[PDB]
Design a protein around this nucleic acid. Sequence first.
RNA 1: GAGGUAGUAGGUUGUAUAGUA
RNA 2: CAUACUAUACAACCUACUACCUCUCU
Lengths: 181, 1635
Amino acid sequence: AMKTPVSILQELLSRRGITPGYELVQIEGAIHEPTFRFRVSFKDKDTFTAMGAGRSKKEAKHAAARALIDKLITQHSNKVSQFHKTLKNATGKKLLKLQKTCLKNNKIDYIKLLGEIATENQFEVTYVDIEEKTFSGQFQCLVQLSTLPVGVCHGSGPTAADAQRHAAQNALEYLKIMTKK
Amino acid sequence: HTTVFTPRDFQVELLATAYERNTIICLGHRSSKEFIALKLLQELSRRARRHGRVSVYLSCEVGTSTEPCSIYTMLTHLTDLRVWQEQPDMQIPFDHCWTDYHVSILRPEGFLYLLETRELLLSRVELIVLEDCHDSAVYQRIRPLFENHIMPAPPADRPRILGLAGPLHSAGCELQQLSAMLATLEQSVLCQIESASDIVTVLRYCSRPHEYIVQCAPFEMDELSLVLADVLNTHKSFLLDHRYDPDPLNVINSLLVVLHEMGPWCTQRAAHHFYQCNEKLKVKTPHERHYLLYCLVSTALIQLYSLCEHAFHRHLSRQTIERYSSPKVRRLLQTLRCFKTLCALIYCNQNHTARVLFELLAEISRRDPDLKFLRCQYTTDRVADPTTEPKEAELEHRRQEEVLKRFRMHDCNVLIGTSVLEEGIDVPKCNLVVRWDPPTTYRSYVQCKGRARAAPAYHVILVAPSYKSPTVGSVQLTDRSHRYICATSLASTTKDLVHQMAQYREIEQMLLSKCANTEPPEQEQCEAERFSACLAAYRPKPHLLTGASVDLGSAIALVNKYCARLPSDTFTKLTALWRCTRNERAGVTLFQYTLRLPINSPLKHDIVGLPMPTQTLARRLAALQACVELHRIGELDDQLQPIGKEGFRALEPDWECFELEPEDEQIVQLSDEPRPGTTKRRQYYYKRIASEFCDCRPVAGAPCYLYFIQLTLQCPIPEEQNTRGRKIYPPEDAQQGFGILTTKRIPKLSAFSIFTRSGEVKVSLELAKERVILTSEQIVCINGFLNYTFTNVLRLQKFLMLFDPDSTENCVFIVPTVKAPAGGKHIDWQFLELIQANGNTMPRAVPDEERQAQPFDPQRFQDAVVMPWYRNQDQPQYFYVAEICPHLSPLSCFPGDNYRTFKHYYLVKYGLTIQNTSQPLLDVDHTSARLNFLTPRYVNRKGVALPTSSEETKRAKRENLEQKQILVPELCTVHPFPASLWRTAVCLPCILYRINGLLLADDIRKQVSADLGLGRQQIFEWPMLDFGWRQKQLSIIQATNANERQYQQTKNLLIGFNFKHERYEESIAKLKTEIESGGMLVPHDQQLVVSMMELLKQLLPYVLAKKLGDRRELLLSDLVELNADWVARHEQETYNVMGDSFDNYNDHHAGFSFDRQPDLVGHPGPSPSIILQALTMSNANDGINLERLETIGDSFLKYAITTYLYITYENVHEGKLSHLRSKQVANLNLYRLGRRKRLGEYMIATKFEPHDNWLPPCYYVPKELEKALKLADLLDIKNLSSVQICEMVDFSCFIPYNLVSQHSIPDKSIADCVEALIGAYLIECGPRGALLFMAWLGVRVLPITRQLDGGNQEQRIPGSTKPNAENVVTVYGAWPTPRSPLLHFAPNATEELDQLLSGFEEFEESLGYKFRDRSYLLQAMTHASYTPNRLTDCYQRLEFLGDAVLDYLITRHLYEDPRQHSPGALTDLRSALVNNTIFASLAVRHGFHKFFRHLSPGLNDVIDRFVRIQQENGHCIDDAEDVEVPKALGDVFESIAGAIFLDSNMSLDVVWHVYSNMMSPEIEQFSNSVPKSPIRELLELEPETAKFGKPEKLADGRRVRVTVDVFCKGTFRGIGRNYRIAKCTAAKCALRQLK
RNA sequence: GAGGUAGUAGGUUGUAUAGUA
RNA sequence: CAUACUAUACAACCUACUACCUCUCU
Ligand SMILES: *O[C@H]1[C@@H](O)[C@H](n2ccc(=O)[nH]c2=O)O[C@@H]1COP(=O)(O)O
Ligand SMILES: [Mg+2]
Ligand SMILES: [Mg+2]
Ligand SMILES: [Mg+2]
Ligand SMILES: [Mg+2]
Ligand SMILES: [Mg+2]
Ligand SMILES: [Mg+2]
Ligand SMILES: [Mg+2]
Ligand SMILES: [Mg+2]
C-alpha cells in the first residue's frame, strides 16, 4: 500500500522481466493548468497499452499505472436639561411658594431660605467676600454652590452684609427662575 | 470665457506693464511681489547684459542682521546672477568694485552712499526695484534718493522705477486725500501706479455682479432682549472689577453684540457655544479666583439659555424667527428666499457668529419647507500651532478639510466663513454672495464680492446700526424685568456707510483709472451684436448648412476653446495675447485688433485683424480671422474644433492601416477571447524542420554529402561529483563515430557543446573530402541501421510514429563511421553488415556447456555493453563496463549477509551455475535514460556551482560493496555496439535537435538576406554557441523661510495698512446720488430683484455697391481687398497703440559606442547562434534565453519609432505622437507582424525531452492520432490520406497538439521574439540593421526612394526589396535632418535668438556640448507659458524625444554590464534611475534650474523651495509635508538630452558622453546597492501589510493627503500637490519611521 | 534501476498589489 | 488614463543537484 502504483505495476510485471515503456504523449499546455498525459505500453512484438492523465507528471505516471493495473486485472443642552431635572427632583413646597408668590418683597431673610433650598437638594453654599476694595468703594462677594458643574453667583453693596444680602437675593430669584418650567 | 478673450494671470500682466514703463505694483502678497521682482530682474538683466548694466533692489529689512534675506536666496538660488546684498557695515573687502555683480541688493542710504561715491552710476543702472513704499518712514528714507536724482537725470537716462508698494486700497490712511497721496507718490518717485491685480482683474476681465446694499431695520428692542440685556449689564460691571486675594470680560462682552444685531434666539444659540467653550476652558484653571469668575460666566450663559428656551418653547421656526429675532436675519432669509447653480459665500467677523448662523441656517433648512435646498457648512479662523496641543489642531484640520470638501464640488451651497476665506483657499464659482458684516476695507469687500464669477450674480450687504454700546451702566435688574420674570438711528450709520461705499467705488474707479488696458462698456458689445451681425462666416463644408459656422459670437468664444485645449501643466495657464490699436481714416476712428497665439500652438504668426468702427467689433472680427486662419492651416476639423488626442490621422502611406489578418481581426473586433498580442492567448505552431533536412534521403545513384559528427572533450567533469569514481572517457580517442548522409549541403554552423557524463564536449560537423555514391542494397542496409539505432538501441520510437523509408519530413540518413587505421575516418560498412546480420535478436539463454567451453577473455569486455540474459528478456537494461576486477571471484565474498558467494548467489536466486570459478568480475554502471545533455548537470546559469556529493557517500560508493553493481562475464551477452559508440549514440539526439535549431536560425537569416539585402545568402565559421558563463531642525528653518514670506504677509494684510505720507467730495456726492437713486441701494421696505448698403457704409466708412453686388453679405477676402486698395491709394497708416512690448519684433518693429554600425554591404548578417538565442523562449530551460535580448530590442523599437514620429510630423505635438507610438509599438502590432512573417513556427518553447519532443531522422508522424482521440498498410495509407481510411478501418478529453511536430506558443512570446530579433540584429549588424529588420517585419520606419534596378544590381545596397514586374527597387535611405524651429516670422530672428539666449555659455560649460543650432537649446528650455518666445515651440514634444533617447541609453549601457543582469535587474536598475525625482535632482545639482526660462508663479515657488532643500542637503538623493519635485525640471533633463540628440546629426554617443558626466558616478552607486523607490520599498519590505486609501481633500484646495496603513505597525499620512507626490512622501515617511 | 521524502537552486504560467516613462 | 519595460507576495507545474528511507539489482 505504501508502494506507489508505478512501483506496484513494476513489481507485478517483474515476474517475467520486461522493461515498461512510458511516453508522455499529450500535454495541454493551457493558460493556467498544464495538464500532462502519458501512455504506458507493454512490449512491441506481440499482444497492451493504456493512457494516463494528470496535472503533474508524477501523478500522470501514477494514473497511467493505475489504468494499466486495472486493465491487467448638542449634548451640552442635554447636560442643561439634566441639570433642570436634578434641580426639579427637589420637590419641596418652597419652590412652589417662590413660583406662585410675586417676589417684589425683599423683607425675607434670604440666607435661611437658600440654606433650606440647598439642604433640600443636598447642596451647600460658600461665601467669599473679596477683601480688596472696588473703585466705587463698596464691598463685593461671590457665593459658590456645588452644582454640576459648580456655580458662582454675585453680589455687592456698601457693607459686606449688603453684598452678602445682594448675593443671597440673587440666589433666591436664581433658584426661583430655575424652578420655573 | 465668452466675449473678453482670456486674461493672463496678473503677475505677468504687471510684469508686462512694468516692462512697458515705470510702475508702482500695488500688490499685497510679498511672494507674488518677489516673483514679479525676480522676473523683471532677469528680463532687464537680459537687456542689461549687453554693455554692462546693474539693477538694484534697495531694501529696508536688510543690513542689520548678517543673514541673507529672502530675495538673496530667491535670486542666487534660481538665476545665474551673482547678487551682492550689502551686509551690515560693508567694508568692500579688497578690490571688489560693484561692476561685476548683476543684481546689487542694497539699502536706500547705501544707495546714496555709492551714488555720492560715484560707484553705482544712476545712468548705468538699468532697474531700481525700490521695495515697499506705501508707508511714511520708507518714503522719508526714499526722499533723498529722488528729490536729488530727478533734476540732473533726464527721463531718457532714468531707468525703470519699479516700486513694490502695498495694496493701494488698504494703504496709508484717510479717504479725502487718498488721490492726492497717490499723486504725490508718483510725482516723488517718478512713477505711474499700474495696479493690475486680483483685486482689479476680477472687476476688469471677469464678471462684474450687480451689488446691492440693503438696510433691514434697526432692532426695535423687545421685552426678552430687554431682560437679557438687563442680566448681562448686571454681570458686566461685576466682571469688570474682579480681584484676587491670597478672559471672561471678552466672552461676556461679545455675547451682547449678538443680541444687539441678531436677536434673542441667536443670543441663546451663541451663548450655548460660549458655554461649551467656557466649560472646556474652566476646568484647567489653576487659580481660585479665576475659577469663580469662569463659573460666574458659565452659569450666566446657562441662565440666558434656559430663559430663552422657556421663553420661545413654553409660550410657543419660520414664525419663531419672524417674531423673536432681528430684522437683519429676516432680510437674510428674504435674500435667500429670492433664489430658487447657487454657490453662497456668506462671511462674518467673529468665529462664534458663524456657528450661531450655522444653527440658524440648519434650523430653517430642516424646518421651513421652502429652503430645503440649503446645505450648510462653516469654518472659523486659525490661531494656534501644532507645537502646542496637537489634538485640537488635528481635530480642526480634519473638520475644516471635510467642510471644504463638502463645499468644493457640488454638495454644500451656503458656506458661512470668516477671514480665512479671502486669501489662500480656492473655492467654486459663487452665485450669490451675502456679506453679513459691513466690510472693514475694500479688501474684505472684494475678496468676498470679487470672487463671484457666474453673472446671474448678486453681492448683497445687509446693514444695520453700527457697532455701538447699548449698555446702560452698573444698574441691577429693572422693575420691567422683574415683571417679565414674575409674569412669564438707521440714517446716521447708513449715511456714513453709503459714504464708505462711495469711497470704495472711488477706490475701484481709481484702480480702473490706473489700469493700462482700457475696457469698452457692455453697451458697446450690445450695440455691436445688435447692429453688425451681417458678415459672411467661414464654412469649409458649405454645401450643408447645419454644421460648420463661425459667426461673431462663436469666433470670440472659439479662440478660448482652442488655446485652453492644448498641452499644458498646472503651472501653465494658456491664453492669446490680444492687442487693440487705433487709427483715423476718412474722418472715422478704426481699431486694428492684432492677436497672437500660445507658443504651444503651431499657428506661429499673428493674425493682424482688419479695422472696425468700435473696439468689440474689431475683437469679434479678429477672432473671425483667427478661426479662418486656424482652419486654413489645418488645426480645426469640419466642426471647427481642435483636432484632439485621438483624432490625429497619419499622412505617410505605410502608417495608419493597422489592419490585422482576419483570424486576428475576428478576435480584435469580437472581444470575447483572450486578447491577441498578450500571453493569455495560445496558438499551436508546427515545428518547422530545416530546409536542408526535408526531402533529403540519398537514393541509389545520387552522390550524397557525408558529415561526421566530430566530438571533443573540453571541460572534463571534476571529481567532486564523481560519486562512482568512474574513468574519464573522451570521445575524441574513440575508434567508432557517427555521421550524416544527406543530399542538400549543410551550411557553416556554430560549434555548440553538450554536457554529458564525461563533462563538456564540443560538437561539430565535418565534411568528407570525397563524395559517397550509395548503391541500392546499401539503401536497405542504412534503413535497417536507422531502425535499430533509434528503435532498439535508444528506444525513442513512439507508438504514434513509424519508420518510413520513403519519407518527406526528417529525411536525413545516419551512418556508423570508423577511424581508418592508416589515418582518417570513413563509413563502417563491415559494421553495418554485422548489424544487419542479427536484427532484433532475442538474447540467448545459453546452456551450461557454452559457458564451460571457453575461459574469460580480457579483450572481449574492453569497450563492451554487458546486458544480462537471465532477466529482462524482451528488452534488457544495458550496463556499461567500468572496471574488470581480478581481485573478485564468483566464490568471493557477498556484499550482504543474506547470501553466500556470487556463484552461490546465482544458483540460489535463479539457478545459473557458473562453470568458471577463476573468472574475474565486472563492476558496471547503468546507461543514460535522460537523453537531454544540453544543460550543464552540476552548475547553474549564473555560474556558481551546485553542491556536489559528500566525501562519506562518495568513499562508500567507491569502496563499500553494498553499493555498486557486479556482473559475471560468463552470464552476460556483449551487445554489438561498443560502449564508446553507445555513448556517442546516446548523445546523438541533442546533437540533432541543436543542429535543427541552428539551421532554423540560419533559415531566418537566409530569408531576410534574400528579401532586404540583409546579410549573405549562402557560403569562415561562426562563433561558438556559448551559454554565457540636528540637520533636520536645520531643515525646518529653510522651509520656515519660505513660509516666512506668507506668514507676516497675512498679518500685514489683516490689521496695519498704516502710515500715510503727509473734486473728490463732488464725485463722492455724485456716486451717492447714483447709488441711492439707481436702485443699487435697496431701501428698507421693498423687495430685491437698416439697409445693407447703408449699414455697410457705416460699418466701414474708411465702390461698396460693387463689392456687395447682388448678394446679401460681404466676404472677408473682399474686406482685405478693399483695405489693400486703400493701402495702395493712401500712403501708410501710422499707428497709435491704445492699451504690448513684451514679445515685440513680429507684430512690431572604442569604449562601447552606442551607435556602432558594421558594414551592412558584404555582411554575413547575424550569427545563427544569437538568432537561436533570440528564438529561444525562456520556457526552454536552456543555457540561452531571449529575455536579455528582448529588453534591449524593445527599447530600440521605442527609440526608433519616437525618432521617426518626430521627424515626419513637424507640427503635431506629443499628445497624439504618443498615441501613434502606442499604436506602432504595442504587442498586438508586433504579434501580427510576427504571425504574418512566420515566427510562431520558428521558435523553441519547451525543454527538449527526446522521449517526448523529437522526430528522429527518417521517422514520420501521421499527424492524425492526436485528433483521432497493418503497419505496411498503415504506411501505404499514411502516404495517401488520413481521415477517410482512418474512419474506414486533467480535463478537455479532446487534447491539443501532438508533442512531436508542434509547440504551443503564446502571442506575446512572438512579440518577444520580434523585439528579441530586433535586438539580435541590433547587436550584430548595427542600429541600421535593426531598422531594416523592422521595415522587413512591417513597421516601416525609414524613407523610401524607389529607384530603377540598374541591370542585375549585384551589390544589392541593403534595405532594398526584390523588384516587382518593372525593374524598380525600393531602397531605404537614412533618417532625414528635421526642421530647426527658428520660425522666421521676425525680420531678425537670429539676433532675437542671441538676445533671448543671453548668458547660457555658463550652461554650455556646465554641459560640455557647444550647440551648433541653439534654437534647439531654447526650445528645450522654454516652458509652455514663456509667452515672449516668438522664435520656437515649447519643450513638450522634444522631451518626447529625449525620454526615449535616455531610456535606450540607460538600457543599452546596463545591458553591457559584465554582471549580466536579469530582465528584472535591467528594469529595476533603470526604473530606479530614470525617474522624475532623480532627473530633477541632477537638474538641480548640475545647474539646470539656473537656466530654465518660464513665467509662471507656482513653478517658480516650487523650484525655489526644492532648490533650497537640495542646497541644504549637498545635492543628495501630524503630516509628512515633504518638498514637491519640479516635474518641469525633470522634463528639462529629458529634453536637453533630446536636443543634444537632434543637434548632433542624430547620434547617441554624444548624448551618452554628455550625460555620463552627470549620471554615471551615480549609476555605479545604484549598480552596487539596491535602490528601489519609496512606494516600492514600502510595499516590498511590507509585501502585503501596506494598504493605501482613497483620497481626501484638504482645506486649501491644492493639497491631497494619503494615509498609508501599515498593518499592526503604524498608520502614517503625508501631503502633497497631486496624488503621485503625496503618495510617494507618505510611503517615504512610513519607510523612514519603521526603521 | 524504480518509488517516497526534505532542502537548495533555476525557471514557466495564473491571481492580487504596485513601481518607472 | 492608455501603451511599452516589469517587481514582490502567494499558488500550480517542470527541470538540475544533494542527504536519507522502501523495493529492486548486486
Ligand atoms: O542510474 C544512473 C547512475 O547510476 C548512472 N551513473 C553512473 C556513473 C556515473 O558517473 N554517473 C551516473 O549518473 O547513470 C544513470 C543515469 O544517469 P543520467 O540519467 O545519465 O543522469
Ligand atoms: Mg538516469
Ligand atoms: Mg517576462
Ligand atoms: Mg515593445
Ligand atoms: Mg517584449
Ligand atoms: Mg536514478
Ligand atoms: Mg528559483
Ligand atoms: Mg513621464
Ligand atoms: Mg514579472
